[PDB]
Amino acid sequence: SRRLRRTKIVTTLGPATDRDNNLEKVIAAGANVVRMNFSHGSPEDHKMRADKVREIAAKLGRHVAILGDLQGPKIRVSTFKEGKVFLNIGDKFLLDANLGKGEGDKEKVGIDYKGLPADVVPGDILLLDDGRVQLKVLEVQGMKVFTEVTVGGPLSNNKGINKLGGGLSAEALTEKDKADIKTAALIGVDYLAVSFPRCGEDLNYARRLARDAGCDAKIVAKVERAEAVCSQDAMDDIILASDVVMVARGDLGVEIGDPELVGIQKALIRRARQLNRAVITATQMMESMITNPMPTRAEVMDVANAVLDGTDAVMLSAETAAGQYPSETVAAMARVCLGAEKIPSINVSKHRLDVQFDNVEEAIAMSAMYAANHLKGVTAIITMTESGRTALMTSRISSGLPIFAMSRHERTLNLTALYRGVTPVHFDSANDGVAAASEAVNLLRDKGYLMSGDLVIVTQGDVMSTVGSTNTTRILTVE
Amino acid sequence: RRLRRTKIVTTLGPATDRDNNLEKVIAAGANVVRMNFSHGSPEDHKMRADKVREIAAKLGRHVAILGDLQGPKIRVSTFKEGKVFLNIGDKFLLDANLGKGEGDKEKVGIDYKGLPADVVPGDILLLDDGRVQLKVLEVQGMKVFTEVTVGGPLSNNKGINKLGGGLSAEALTEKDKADIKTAALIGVDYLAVSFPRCGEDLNYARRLARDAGCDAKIVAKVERAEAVCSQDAMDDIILASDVVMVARGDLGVEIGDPELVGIQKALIRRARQLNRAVITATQMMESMITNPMPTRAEVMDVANAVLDGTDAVMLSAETAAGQYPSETVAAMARVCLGAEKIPSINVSKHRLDVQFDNVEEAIAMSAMYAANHLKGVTAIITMTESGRTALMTSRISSGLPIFAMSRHERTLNLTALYRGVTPVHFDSANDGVAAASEAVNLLRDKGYLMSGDLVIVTQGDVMSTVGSTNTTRILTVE
Ligand SMILES: [Mg+2]
C-alpha cells in the first residue's frame, strides 16, 4: 500500500532505446506503452524491437502495450544540397513539386506532397518547421508556388509544412501507410494510430485495412488538423470512430493558434472521457531532456496540467527514441505525474450527474466508482474483466484509488496498460463468483497492494447464463 | 476590440536601457515594470523611474512601478577558477571564511555565514536550482563536510537551497534597508519583500518603508517551504501582504517542482479569496532570452496561470537581459488573450456561502453578479479614488473589462496591476448620476463602449463625509 502512479507513460522507441540496455531501463522506470514510429526504421527494426519488448516484459513481469504509429503524408520541403540560409524580409521563395535535391538558398525547393499547388491560393500562409519559418503565397503556376518571406530563419532538410488553418487535401493513408498496417498486423500491435485523419471515414478505412490483414487493434485517432477541432460535430465524428484519442500538439498548434491549443486540448480530453474513450497527450512533453538530465519548469507544469486535465497518458518521442536520458526522462515524467495526482481537483468526480446509462456494465462501473470514492476505508477498485471494458469505464471517473484489472489474457492486460489508474494484474483462477473475487483480493494482498483491514470494491459478471457481462459489485474486507 | 485582462510585469535592465527598448516593452503592453534591487546602483533605478514616467506620460498609459528587494544572498561566494566538477561520491566542503579561493578540491565560501548551524548530517543542499546537489556528512565549527551525489558545473555566485525548509537567514538584509530607502525616494507603487518566513517579516519591511515616508503596497514573495507548510502559515503571509508573488524559482527547488503546481494553484485561489492580487513570477518564457519564439510548454505554463486565475504574469531576464524584450512582451500578451477565451476563466460562482460585512465589498460583488448575468453588458466601471472597488470587482472571474476611474495618479498606477482593470483618469466636480454619465461618455468617446451598450457602474453617492462606495447603476450608453 504505497501510492501508485495513475497517469500512464507512452515512450517512442529508436536508436537511444536499442543502444546499451536502455529499452529495459525505460520499461523498469515505468513505461506502460511502447510506441513504434513507422516514420523511421524498417519492418525488421520494428519486429526485432517487438520481440525484445515482449521478452523484457516477460522477464520483468510487466504488462507493456505496443503502439504502432503510422507516418501519414509527408508534407515536408524535401532536400537541398546543404545550404540552409533564408533571410527575414520579403525575399521570394519557390516551392516546386517537380524538383530533386537542388539547394534552397534562393527561391527553390521541391515538395514531397505533389498536391500542394491544388491546395493553396494567393494569400495563404505556410508555416515551415512549426512556424520557425513562415511564407505567404503570391501565386500558383502549374507545380510551382511563389511565396514571400514574412518571418524568416534557418530552413533545414525535410522540415514540415502546415497551412494556417485547415486546407490541405492530402490523403491520410499513404501507400507506405498501407504497407505499415500490414507490418503492425504481423507484429500484433495493441493500438494502431492513424496520422492526419480528415473525418471518421479515414479511420474506418484504416481499421478495415487492419482487419483485412488480420489485426483487431484499437485505433488511436491522431488529432493533428484544424479540420478535426473546428466544431463539436467534427470532434465527435473523429472521436467516435476511434478507440483512443491522441492529442498531438505540434502540427495542431501550428495550424490553429498555439494559444488556442490549450482550450482545444482540455476540450478533447474532456470529450474523450465523456464518450468512454481513452486519451493520450502527446508530442514532446519534456523536450529539454533530449539534451539535459532534468526538465524545464514549464515542461513540468505542462505535464502536470495535462494530468489535471484528465489525460489517460502522456508521451515521450525523441526523449526516449533519440535522446541522452531515456530512462531518466521516464523517471522524471513519472515523478511529475505522481506529484500532480495529489492535487484534490483530479481526485474528485461529480459521477456523471444528469447522465443516463443504457448499459448494465457501465452502470456497475459508475456505481462502483461512486461507492468507492465515498466509503471510508476503501483502498482499491478491482475489476475482474476478461475484455478490459469495465476497467475502461471505471477509469473514466476521477479518483485517487488504484483500479486493478484482472484478466487471463495478455492482450487484455496489455490493453489496460494505457488506461488511467489501471494496474493490469494477471489472474487465471478456474473459480468464479465470490471465490474468484476473494482469490483476487488475496493475490493483490500477497503482492503488496492491499492490507489486512482494507475495504475493496469488486466488479464481476455473475449470472446463471451465457448471456451478459459484468453485472455485480461486491464490497469486501481483505483477509 | 476585446481587451487583455491578465497583466504583464516586466523587469528592467541593460536590455531595456539599450536602444529604445523600454518604450517598446511599454508599447507592447507592459503594465508594471519591476526594478530588481539585486543588480544595479540606486541611481540606475532612479534614472529608469524617470524614464518610465516620461514614456507613460508620452503614450497616455498608466504603468505601475514595483521594487523587488534582493533578500539574503544564500550563494556559493566565488572562486579563482572552478566551473566544473564530477561526482560519484566525491567530497565537498562549505567554509564560511573565504573570499576567492578555488572550487575544486572541495572548498568554497558561503556568503550566508549562518548555513553551518542550519544543516545537520543527512541534509541535502541543492545548488544552482538543483543542477548540483550535496548531502551533508558532518559539521564542525564553521565548516560543513558533504558528499556531492548529483553534480555538474558550479559557476560563480550560484544559489544554495536546503531541500525542504530549514535555513534561518534574516529576510531583511542591510542592503534591503538601504534599498527600501531608495524605493521610498523613487516612490514605488509596489514593494516586494524577499524570503519572508511569517507576516512579522512583512510588517518589519512595511514599517521600514513607513519610516521612510513610503506607503507602497507590500508584495510577499512566497519562496519558502515555511510559507506553504500549512494553511495557517499561508494565511499569515497573505494577510500581512497586499500582493502575493508565487516565486517559483526557489520554492520549486525547496519543495519539489511537482508540488509546485498545486501550491501555485492554492496560493492564487487563496490570494483572491482574501481580496489580494497575485503575480505568477520569474522566467515564464525563458526560451525568449535567446530565441524569438516561445516554447510550447512555456505557452502552456503561461496560459494555465491565466486559467488558475492569476492577476499577472512576470518576465525577468526576458526583458532585463535578453535579445527580444518587446517581442517577448507581445508573445506573452497573445498567449494571455488566447487563454482568456476559455469559458472556465470567464465564469464565477460569485462567492456562494460567503457573507460580507463591508458595504463596498457587497456593492462590488452584486455589481459583478449583475454584469456577468445581464445580457448586453459590455463593461464594469468602478468610480473609486482609492481603487478598492477595482481590487474587489476584479477578484471575480469575468470576460468583461473593468474601467477604474480615479483622479489620482497613484490610484491609476496601483490599479494597473489588477486583472482585467483598465485605469482611466477622471475628475468631474459633478456628483451622482451626472459624473456617472460623464464617465460613461468619456469611455465611449475614447472608443471603449458603443452607443447601444449597457454598463455597470459603482460609485459612492451620499450626502455625508462618512463612507465610500455604496451605489450601483446599470446605464445605457448615449
Ligand atoms: Mg494486431
Short mmCIF file of N, CA, C and O in Angstrom, two decimals, chain B residues 114-216:
data_model
loop_
_atom_site.label_atom_id
_atom_site.label_comp_id
_atom_site.label_asym_id
_atom_site.label_seq_id
_atom_site.Cartn_x
_atom_site.Cartn_y
_atom_site.Cartn_z
N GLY B 114 25.58 31.83 8.30
CA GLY B 114 24.75 31.04 9.19
C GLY B 114 24.34 29.68 8.67
O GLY B 114 23.59 28.99 9.36
N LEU B 115 24.82 29.28 7.49
CA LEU B 115 24.47 27.97 6.95
C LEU B 115 24.94 26.80 7.82
O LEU B 115 24.14 25.87 8.01
N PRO B 116 26.16 26.77 8.36
CA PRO B 116 26.59 25.58 9.11
C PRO B 116 25.71 25.20 10.29
O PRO B 116 25.57 24.00 10.56
N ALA B 117 25.10 26.14 11.01
CA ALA B 117 24.24 25.71 12.11
C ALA B 117 22.82 25.36 11.67
O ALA B 117 22.00 25.01 12.52
N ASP B 118 22.51 25.46 10.38
CA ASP B 118 21.21 25.07 9.86
C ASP B 118 21.22 23.72 9.14
O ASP B 118 20.14 23.17 8.90
N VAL B 119 22.39 23.21 8.78
CA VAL B 119 22.49 21.88 8.18
C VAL B 119 22.88 20.89 9.27
O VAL B 119 23.59 21.21 10.24
N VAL B 120 22.40 19.66 9.11
CA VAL B 120 22.54 18.56 10.07
C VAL B 120 22.82 17.30 9.26
O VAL B 120 22.21 17.13 8.19
N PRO B 121 23.73 16.40 9.71
CA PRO B 121 24.04 15.19 8.93
C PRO B 121 22.83 14.54 8.28
O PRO B 121 21.86 14.18 8.96
N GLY B 122 22.87 14.41 6.95
CA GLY B 122 21.75 13.88 6.18
C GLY B 122 21.02 14.91 5.34
O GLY B 122 20.23 14.51 4.47
N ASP B 123 21.27 16.20 5.56
CA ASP B 123 20.64 17.26 4.78
C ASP B 123 21.27 17.36 3.39
O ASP B 123 22.46 17.12 3.20
N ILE B 124 20.43 17.74 2.43
CA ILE B 124 20.83 17.91 1.04
C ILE B 124 20.75 19.39 0.70
O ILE B 124 19.73 20.04 0.96
N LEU B 125 21.83 19.93 0.14
CA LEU B 125 21.89 21.29 -0.36
C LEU B 125 21.85 21.23 -1.87
O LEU B 125 22.71 20.61 -2.49
N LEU B 126 20.84 21.86 -2.46
CA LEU B 126 20.68 21.96 -3.90
C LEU B 126 21.25 23.29 -4.38
O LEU B 126 20.73 24.35 -4.02
N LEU B 127 22.30 23.23 -5.18
CA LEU B 127 22.99 24.39 -5.69
C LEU B 127 22.67 24.58 -7.17
O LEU B 127 22.52 23.60 -7.91
N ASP B 128 22.59 25.85 -7.58
CA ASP B 128 22.12 26.24 -8.91
C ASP B 128 20.88 25.44 -9.29
O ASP B 128 20.98 24.48 -10.05
N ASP B 129 19.72 25.84 -8.76
CA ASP B 129 18.43 25.18 -8.97
C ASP B 129 18.55 23.66 -9.05
O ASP B 129 17.92 23.03 -9.90
N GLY B 130 19.35 23.06 -8.17
CA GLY B 130 19.45 21.62 -8.12
C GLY B 130 20.28 21.00 -9.21
O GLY B 130 20.39 19.76 -9.25
N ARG B 131 20.86 21.80 -10.11
CA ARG B 131 21.77 21.26 -11.11
C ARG B 131 22.99 20.61 -10.46
O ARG B 131 23.58 19.68 -11.03
N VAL B 132 23.39 21.07 -9.27
CA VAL B 132 24.32 20.34 -8.43
C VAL B 132 23.64 20.11 -7.09
O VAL B 132 22.77 20.89 -6.68
N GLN B 133 23.98 19.02 -6.41
CA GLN B 133 23.45 18.72 -5.09
C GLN B 133 24.59 18.28 -4.19
O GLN B 133 25.71 18.06 -4.65
N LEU B 134 24.31 18.22 -2.89
CA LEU B 134 25.30 17.83 -1.89
C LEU B 134 24.56 17.22 -0.70
O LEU B 134 23.53 17.75 -0.29
N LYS B 135 25.06 16.12 -0.16
CA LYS B 135 24.50 15.54 1.06
C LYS B 135 25.48 15.75 2.19
O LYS B 135 26.67 15.41 2.06
N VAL B 136 25.01 16.32 3.30
CA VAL B 136 25.92 16.78 4.34
C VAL B 136 26.29 15.61 5.24
O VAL B 136 25.43 14.85 5.71
N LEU B 137 27.60 15.43 5.46
CA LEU B 137 28.13 14.39 6.32
C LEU B 137 28.31 14.87 7.75
O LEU B 137 27.87 14.22 8.69
N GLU B 138 28.95 16.02 7.90
CA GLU B 138 29.46 16.42 9.21
C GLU B 138 29.57 17.93 9.23
O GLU B 138 29.71 18.56 8.19
N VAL B 139 29.49 18.52 10.42
CA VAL B 139 29.70 19.95 10.52
C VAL B 139 30.46 20.25 11.80
O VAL B 139 30.02 19.88 12.90
N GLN B 140 31.62 20.89 11.66
CA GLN B 140 32.47 21.24 12.79
C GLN B 140 32.87 22.70 12.68
O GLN B 140 33.39 23.14 11.64
N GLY B 141 32.59 23.46 13.74
CA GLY B 141 32.77 24.90 13.71
C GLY B 141 31.95 25.52 12.59
O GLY B 141 30.73 25.32 12.49
N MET B 142 32.63 26.27 11.72
CA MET B 142 32.00 26.89 10.56
C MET B 142 32.39 26.18 9.26
O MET B 142 32.35 26.79 8.19
N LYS B 143 32.76 24.90 9.34
CA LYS B 143 32.97 24.07 8.16
C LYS B 143 31.92 22.97 8.10
O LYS B 143 31.54 22.39 9.12
N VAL B 144 31.43 22.70 6.89
CA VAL B 144 30.37 21.73 6.66
C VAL B 144 30.83 20.78 5.56
O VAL B 144 31.03 21.19 4.40
N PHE B 145 31.06 19.52 5.94
CA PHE B 145 31.51 18.45 5.07
C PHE B 145 30.32 17.73 4.47
O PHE B 145 29.43 17.27 5.20
N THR B 146 30.35 17.57 3.15
CA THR B 146 29.27 16.98 2.39
C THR B 146 29.90 16.05 1.35
O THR B 146 31.10 16.10 1.09
N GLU B 147 29.07 15.18 0.78
CA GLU B 147 29.41 14.46 -0.43
C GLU B 147 28.41 14.86 -1.52
O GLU B 147 27.30 15.30 -1.22
N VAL B 148 28.83 14.73 -2.78
CA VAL B 148 28.23 15.54 -3.85
C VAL B 148 26.98 14.89 -4.47
O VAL B 148 26.04 15.60 -4.83
N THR B 149 26.93 13.57 -4.63
CA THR B 149 25.74 12.90 -5.18
C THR B 149 25.39 13.34 -6.61
O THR B 149 25.91 12.78 -7.58
N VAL B 150 24.48 14.33 -6.77
CA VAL B 150 24.14 14.88 -8.08
C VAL B 150 25.06 16.06 -8.38
O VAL B 150 25.31 16.89 -7.50
N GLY B 151 25.57 16.14 -9.62
CA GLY B 151 26.55 17.16 -9.94
C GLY B 151 26.55 17.74 -11.34
O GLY B 151 25.60 17.60 -12.11
N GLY B 152 27.65 18.43 -11.68
CA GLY B 152 27.74 19.15 -12.92
C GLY B 152 28.66 20.35 -12.79
O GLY B 152 29.64 20.33 -12.04
N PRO B 153 28.37 21.43 -13.53
CA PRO B 153 29.16 22.65 -13.39
C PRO B 153 28.66 23.52 -12.24
O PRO B 153 27.45 23.61 -11.98
N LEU B 154 29.60 24.13 -11.54
CA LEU B 154 29.31 25.05 -10.44
C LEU B 154 29.97 26.38 -10.77
O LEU B 154 31.17 26.56 -10.53
N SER B 155 29.19 27.32 -11.30
CA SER B 155 29.73 28.63 -11.69
C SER B 155 29.85 29.60 -10.52
O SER B 155 29.85 29.19 -9.36
N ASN B 156 29.96 30.89 -10.84
CA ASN B 156 30.12 31.94 -9.83
C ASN B 156 28.78 32.32 -9.21
O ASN B 156 27.76 32.40 -9.91
N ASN B 157 28.79 32.55 -7.89
CA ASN B 157 27.68 33.17 -7.17
C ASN B 157 26.35 32.45 -7.37
O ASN B 157 25.29 33.09 -7.42
N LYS B 158 26.39 31.12 -7.49
CA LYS B 158 25.17 30.35 -7.67
C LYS B 158 24.48 30.11 -6.32
O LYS B 158 25.13 30.05 -5.28
N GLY B 159 23.15 30.01 -6.36
CA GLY B 159 22.39 29.92 -5.13
C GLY B 159 22.48 28.56 -4.46
O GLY B 159 22.85 27.56 -5.07
N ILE B 160 22.15 28.54 -3.17
CA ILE B 160 22.00 27.33 -2.38
C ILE B 160 20.58 27.29 -1.83
O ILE B 160 20.06 28.31 -1.39
N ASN B 161 19.94 26.11 -1.90
CA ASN B 161 18.70 25.85 -1.18
C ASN B 161 18.84 24.58 -0.36
O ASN B 161 19.53 23.64 -0.75
N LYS B 162 18.18 24.57 0.78
CA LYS B 162 18.00 23.34 1.54
C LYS B 162 16.76 22.63 1.00
O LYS B 162 15.73 23.27 0.77
N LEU B 163 16.87 21.32 0.76
CA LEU B 163 15.68 20.54 0.44
C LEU B 163 14.71 20.59 1.62
O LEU B 163 15.09 20.23 2.75
N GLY B 164 13.47 21.02 1.37
CA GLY B 164 12.55 21.33 2.45
C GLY B 164 12.92 22.66 3.07
O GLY B 164 13.81 23.37 2.58
N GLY B 165 12.24 23.01 4.16
CA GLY B 165 12.53 24.27 4.84
C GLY B 165 13.95 24.41 5.37
O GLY B 165 14.93 24.10 4.68
N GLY B 166 14.09 24.91 6.59
CA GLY B 166 15.37 24.77 7.26
C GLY B 166 16.20 26.01 7.49
O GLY B 166 16.52 26.31 8.64
N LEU B 167 16.60 26.72 6.43
CA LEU B 167 17.53 27.83 6.62
C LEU B 167 16.91 28.90 7.51
O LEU B 167 15.68 29.03 7.61
N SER B 168 17.76 29.65 8.21
CA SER B 168 17.27 30.59 9.21
C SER B 168 17.78 32.00 8.95
O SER B 168 17.89 32.81 9.88
N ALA B 169 18.09 32.31 7.69
CA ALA B 169 18.62 33.62 7.35
C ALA B 169 17.57 34.70 7.59
O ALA B 169 16.36 34.47 7.48
N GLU B 170 18.04 35.89 7.94
CA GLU B 170 17.15 37.02 8.14
C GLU B 170 16.67 37.54 6.79
O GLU B 170 17.46 37.70 5.86
N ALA B 171 15.36 37.82 6.70
CA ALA B 171 14.73 38.20 5.43
C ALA B 171 15.17 39.59 4.98
O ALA B 171 15.55 39.77 3.82
N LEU B 172 15.12 40.58 5.87
CA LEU B 172 15.56 41.93 5.55
C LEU B 172 17.07 42.07 5.82
O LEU B 172 17.51 42.07 6.97
N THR B 173 17.86 42.20 4.77
CA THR B 173 19.28 42.46 4.94
C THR B 173 19.52 43.96 5.14
O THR B 173 18.61 44.79 5.05
N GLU B 174 20.79 44.32 5.39
CA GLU B 174 21.15 45.73 5.45
C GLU B 174 21.05 46.37 4.07
O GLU B 174 20.62 47.53 3.93
N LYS B 175 21.42 45.62 3.03
CA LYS B 175 21.21 46.11 1.68
C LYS B 175 19.73 46.36 1.42
O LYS B 175 19.36 47.36 0.80
N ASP B 176 18.86 45.46 1.90
CA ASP B 176 17.43 45.68 1.74
C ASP B 176 16.99 46.96 2.42
O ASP B 176 16.08 47.63 1.93
N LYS B 177 17.63 47.32 3.54
CA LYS B 177 17.22 48.51 4.26
C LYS B 177 17.60 49.76 3.49
O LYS B 177 16.79 50.69 3.28
N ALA B 178 18.83 49.77 2.98
CA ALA B 178 19.22 50.83 2.07
C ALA B 178 18.24 50.91 0.89
O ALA B 178 17.77 52.00 0.52
N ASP B 179 17.89 49.76 0.31
CA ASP B 179 17.07 49.82 -0.90
C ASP B 179 15.62 50.16 -0.60
O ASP B 179 14.94 50.71 -1.47
N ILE B 180 15.11 49.84 0.60
CA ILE B 180 13.79 50.36 0.99
C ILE B 180 13.83 51.87 0.98
O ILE B 180 12.87 52.53 0.54
N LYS B 181 14.96 52.46 1.41
CA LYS B 181 15.07 53.93 1.35
C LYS B 181 15.08 54.43 -0.09
O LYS B 181 14.45 55.45 -0.42
N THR B 182 15.80 53.72 -0.97
CA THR B 182 15.81 54.11 -2.39
C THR B 182 14.42 53.96 -3.02
O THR B 182 14.00 54.79 -3.84
N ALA B 183 13.70 52.90 -2.68
CA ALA B 183 12.37 52.70 -3.22
C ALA B 183 11.43 53.79 -2.71
O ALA B 183 10.55 54.25 -3.47
N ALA B 184 11.62 54.23 -1.47
CA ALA B 184 10.85 55.37 -0.96
C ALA B 184 11.14 56.65 -1.75
O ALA B 184 10.21 57.39 -2.09
N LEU B 185 12.41 56.92 -2.05
CA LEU B 185 12.75 58.09 -2.87
C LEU B 185 12.15 58.01 -4.26
O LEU B 185 11.63 59.01 -4.79
N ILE B 186 12.20 56.83 -4.89
CA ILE B 186 11.57 56.65 -6.20
C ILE B 186 10.06 56.83 -6.10
O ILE B 186 9.42 57.39 -7.00
N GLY B 187 9.45 56.36 -5.00
CA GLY B 187 8.01 56.37 -4.90
C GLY B 187 7.35 55.19 -5.60
O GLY B 187 6.38 55.37 -6.34
N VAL B 188 7.88 53.98 -5.36
CA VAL B 188 7.35 52.77 -5.98
C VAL B 188 5.89 52.56 -5.60
O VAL B 188 5.45 52.97 -4.51
N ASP B 189 5.13 51.94 -6.50
CA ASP B 189 3.74 51.63 -6.21
C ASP B 189 3.64 50.37 -5.37
O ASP B 189 2.77 50.25 -4.49
N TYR B 190 4.54 49.42 -5.65
CA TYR B 190 4.57 48.11 -5.02
C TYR B 190 6.00 47.85 -4.59
O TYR B 190 6.95 48.22 -5.28
N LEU B 191 6.16 47.17 -3.46
CA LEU B 191 7.47 46.87 -2.90
C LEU B 191 7.48 45.42 -2.45
O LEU B 191 6.69 45.03 -1.57
N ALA B 192 8.37 44.62 -3.03
CA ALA B 192 8.37 43.17 -2.85
C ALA B 192 9.41 42.78 -1.81
O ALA B 192 10.57 43.17 -1.92
N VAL B 193 9.01 41.99 -0.83
CA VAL B 193 9.89 41.55 0.25
C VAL B 193 10.30 40.11 0.01
O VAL B 193 9.46 39.20 0.05
N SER B 194 11.60 39.88 -0.15
CA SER B 194 12.13 38.54 -0.33
C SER B 194 12.15 37.78 0.99
O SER B 194 12.11 38.37 2.07
N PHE B 195 12.16 36.44 0.88
CA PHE B 195 12.37 35.45 1.95
C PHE B 195 11.54 35.64 3.22
O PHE B 195 12.07 35.37 4.31
N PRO B 196 10.27 36.06 3.17
CA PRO B 196 9.53 36.20 4.44
C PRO B 196 9.12 34.85 5.01
O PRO B 196 8.49 34.03 4.34
N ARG B 197 9.50 34.62 6.26
CA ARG B 197 9.08 33.40 6.96
C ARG B 197 7.63 33.50 7.44
O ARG B 197 6.85 32.55 7.28
N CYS B 198 7.25 34.63 8.03
CA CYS B 198 5.91 34.86 8.54
C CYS B 198 5.47 36.28 8.18
O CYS B 198 6.20 37.03 7.54
N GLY B 199 4.27 36.65 8.60
CA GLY B 199 3.82 38.01 8.39
C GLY B 199 4.64 39.06 9.13
O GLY B 199 4.72 40.20 8.68
N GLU B 200 5.25 38.69 10.26
CA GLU B 200 6.07 39.64 11.01
C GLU B 200 7.15 40.24 10.12
O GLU B 200 7.46 41.44 10.24
N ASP B 201 7.74 39.43 9.23
CA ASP B 201 8.78 39.94 8.34
C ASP B 201 8.22 41.03 7.44
O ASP B 201 8.84 42.09 7.25
N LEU B 202 7.05 40.76 6.86
CA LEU B 202 6.39 41.75 6.02
C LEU B 202 6.09 43.02 6.81
O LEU B 202 6.29 44.14 6.30
N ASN B 203 5.65 42.88 8.06
CA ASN B 203 5.39 44.02 8.92
C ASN B 203 6.66 44.83 9.20
O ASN B 203 6.61 46.07 9.34
N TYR B 204 7.81 44.16 9.31
CA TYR B 204 9.05 44.89 9.52
C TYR B 204 9.40 45.72 8.30
O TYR B 204 9.72 46.91 8.42
N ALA B 205 9.37 45.09 7.13
CA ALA B 205 9.59 45.81 5.89
C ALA B 205 8.63 46.99 5.74
O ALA B 205 9.03 48.09 5.34
N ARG B 206 7.35 46.76 6.05
CA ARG B 206 6.39 47.83 5.85
C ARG B 206 6.66 48.99 6.82
O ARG B 206 6.48 50.15 6.44
N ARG B 207 7.10 48.70 8.05
CA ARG B 207 7.46 49.81 8.92
C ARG B 207 8.70 50.55 8.40
O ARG B 207 8.75 51.78 8.43
N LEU B 208 9.73 49.83 7.95
CA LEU B 208 10.88 50.49 7.35
C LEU B 208 10.46 51.43 6.21
O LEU B 208 10.91 52.58 6.14
N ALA B 209 9.56 50.97 5.34
CA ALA B 209 9.03 51.86 4.31
C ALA B 209 8.26 53.03 4.93
O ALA B 209 8.37 54.18 4.45
N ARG B 210 7.49 52.78 5.98
CA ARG B 210 6.69 53.84 6.58
C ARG B 210 7.59 54.93 7.17
O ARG B 210 7.40 56.12 6.91
N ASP B 211 8.61 54.54 7.93
CA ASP B 211 9.57 55.50 8.46
C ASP B 211 10.23 56.31 7.36
O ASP B 211 10.67 57.44 7.60
N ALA B 212 10.34 55.75 6.17
CA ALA B 212 10.95 56.45 5.06
C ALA B 212 9.93 57.27 4.29
O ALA B 212 10.27 57.85 3.25
N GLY B 213 8.71 57.35 4.78
CA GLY B 213 7.69 58.10 4.08
C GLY B 213 7.04 57.37 2.93
O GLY B 213 6.45 58.02 2.06
N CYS B 214 7.12 56.03 2.90
CA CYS B 214 6.62 55.24 1.77
C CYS B 214 5.46 54.36 2.21
O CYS B 214 5.61 53.55 3.13
N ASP B 215 4.32 54.51 1.56
CA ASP B 215 3.13 53.73 1.87
C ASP B 215 2.82 52.72 0.77
O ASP B 215 1.67 52.32 0.58
N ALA B 216 3.87 52.30 0.04
CA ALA B 216 3.75 51.33 -1.04
C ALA B 216 2.96 50.11 -0.59
O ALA B 216 2.95 49.76 0.59
#
